Write a protein that binds this ligand. Sequence first.
Ligand SMILES: N[C@@H](CCC(=O)O)C(=O)O
Length: 288
Amino acid sequence: PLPTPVGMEIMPPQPPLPPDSSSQDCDPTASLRPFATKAEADAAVADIRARGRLIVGLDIGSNLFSFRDPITGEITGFDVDIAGEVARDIFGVPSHVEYRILSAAERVTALQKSQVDIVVKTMSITCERRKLVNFSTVYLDANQRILAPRDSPITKVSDLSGKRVCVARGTTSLRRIREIAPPPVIVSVVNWADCLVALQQREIDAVSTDDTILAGLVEEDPYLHIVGPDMADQPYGVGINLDNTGLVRFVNGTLERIRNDGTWNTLYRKWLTVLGPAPAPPTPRYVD
Ligand SMILES: N[C@@H](CCC(=O)O)C(=O)O
């Protein structure tokens, strides 16, 4: 008897939402400059260092980003390795991490409640989210696209109308699909692996989310392919409690380091060559 994604919901039919120009960009990707001195940086993470490990929110439902490797049994992926570089800067080695398993829908609340130090879970930086949490500079820039079986006629956004499209709850992906007119039948799940299972069992017709995540689903199921135009920019940031500006500055120093010392390029080649040759790392933007 076939696996079933626990938590699969067919959403109530709703009229399309307009594309949001009201609060579109508050310049959301601009973040806080790193500390100039090593001593300042070490002081900003003294509490984490005293706790003995960095507590990182993510889940294991995003192949290539955060997932459990079936051979080693370890949580691994690009987001796991990004978080490990923060831990390296705090402790000297990347090993000192504890994961709190959080769905996409739980990222903001976990940060608000100080249940994790950081979220590294493909977290798009948006103006709406910046009212509630803080973010590092951009560490990867993705774009929303469409994933369908190779024999599917779906190749453009308008083809999704009336068809069953899967998104994880609590994502920008859902908001963007809610703009499509006429609407698709919107099926929501806990995580992106659940969308893959639904498609493999022909319970949906397509998945739409970050092309990075979709490429991870293609790696698991090469019967699928990515189609369609860029539907919405997705600049990933490390999510941080709104008031912990010192940790924002610290993480932004880590990102400056890995953009410039080759680590970012190494991590891209390690995980993301399905997307093509490594681009330059995203250029950071600073408010101050
Ligand atoms: N990156 C988008 C969609 C993918 C995801 O994070 O689950 C978001 O922050 O919601």
